[PDB]
Design a protein around this ligand. Structure first.
Ligand code: ABV
Length: 220
């Protein structure tokens, strides 16, 4: 399948990314609290449900939440301000809380079942979010005695995600805090704007994009 792209809502950020976030890829977005990474997550969960002409892939979403940062009311707001139906948009976001790192890995392994079910329907899964990729791993595996196992499990987790992305033509989007992944770093700009910087992309030049957070989620 040809690589599909989902608009982030921001034309500036889309340009930096070569058009939007890619299917068959993991996009990994870093940022401190208030950087805009979870807002970008929420915006993508809406955008992907649009037709390609509007920057989406006519897709469903699966959302794995590790620290209780998913906000249904924010989905509704973004959906409505983009002229969409907030109830329909929310219905097509499948939600799962991950309680710990083992559970998080289990959820990704078993996510394949639902992806298979939706694969040849009108709303195949096109976005899988893990927000956030590392909070549980960082919490559970403390100090140098734990590092080896931590990296092992995380590596396996990322491999499971890459496989789902590649096999089923899904854009995987994960958040983190400071290949395999396309790494984007968010920071505060001036006047409440945010800045994204792309780093170490094999086939996209490094660069920066300034964007805003609005009732539409993110946009220029
Ligand atoms: N195994 C998984 N089931 C679900 C359900 C909703 C969202 C994400 C996931 S991952």
């Amino acid at each position: 399948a040809t690589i599909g792209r989902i608009s982030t809502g921001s034309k500036s950020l889309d340009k930096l990314l070569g058009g939007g976030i890619e299917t068959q890829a993991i996009t990994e977005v870093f940022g401190e609290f208030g950087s805009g990474k979870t807002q970008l997550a929420h915006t993508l969960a809406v955008m992907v449900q649009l037709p390609p002409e509007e920057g989406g892939l006519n897709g469903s979403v699966m959302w794995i939440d590790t620290e209780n940062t998913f906000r249904p009311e924010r989905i509704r707001e973004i959906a409505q301000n983009r002229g969409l139906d907030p109830d329909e948009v929310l219905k097509h976001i499948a939600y799962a809380r991950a309680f710990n790192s083992n559970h998080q890995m289990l959820l990704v392994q078993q996510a394949e079942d639902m992806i298979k079910e939706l694969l040849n329907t009108d709303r195949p899964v096109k976005l899988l979010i893990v927000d956030s990729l590392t909070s549980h791993f960082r919490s559970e595996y403390i100090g140098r005695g734990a590092l080896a196992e931590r990296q092992q499990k995380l590596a396996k987790h990322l491999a499971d995600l890459h496989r789902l992305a590649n096999l089923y033509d899904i854009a995987v989007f994960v958040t983190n805090q400071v290949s395999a992944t396309l790494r984007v770093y968010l920071r505060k700009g001036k006047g409440g704007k945010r800045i994204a910087r792309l780093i170490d992309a094999p086939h996209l030049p490094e660069g920066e994009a300034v964007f805003s957070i609005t009732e539409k989620g993110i946009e220029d």
